[PDB]
Amino acid sequence: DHCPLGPGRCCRLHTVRASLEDLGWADWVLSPREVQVTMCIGACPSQFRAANMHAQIKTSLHRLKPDTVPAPCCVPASYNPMVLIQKTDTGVSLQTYDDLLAKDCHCI
């Protein structure tokens, strides 16, 4: 919360519409036909949603040695599960996947 790069431009949840083809799942997934992928995107400037102590250090070191240490990664803090209906050789399977959709975002 509060982005020094202007609203929306910092690490936050986005929804990107993807078809089975996009994912490379059209051979094994039957339903759903497309997925609203929740995903963490945006910049990670100083003190923005720092995940932990490591993330603060990363911020300070990147500011100081941009050549050696990269900016912190915008990444999921937690995930939502998803139900996939998949194809088997003789029928169908119903499977829950745990770490598929991003729930929450932080920087590291």
Binding site for a second copy (CB under 8 A): 16, 18, 22-24, 37, 39, 41, 51-54, 57-58, 60-61, 64-65, 68-70, 73-76, 79, 97-102, 108
- 69 and 108 Cβ atoms separated by less than 8 Å: no
Task: Name every residue whose Cβ is closer than 8 Å to that of residue 66 and which is 6 or more positions away in sequence.
Answer: none
Q: Measured from the CB atom, is 3 or 100 closer to a second copy?
A: 100
Residue 32 C-beta: closest distance to a second copy, Å = 14
Residue (of 2, 39, 1, 23) closest to 86 by Cα position:
23
Nearest-approach distance from CB 2 to a second copy, in angstroms: 20
Contact criterion met (CB below 8 Å) for 87 and 30: yes
Shorter beta-carbon distance to a second copy: residue 4 or 22: 22
* Minimum separation from the CB atom of position 18 to a second copy (A): 6
Question: How far apart (Å, rounded) are the C-alpha atoms in residues 98 and 31?
Answer: 17
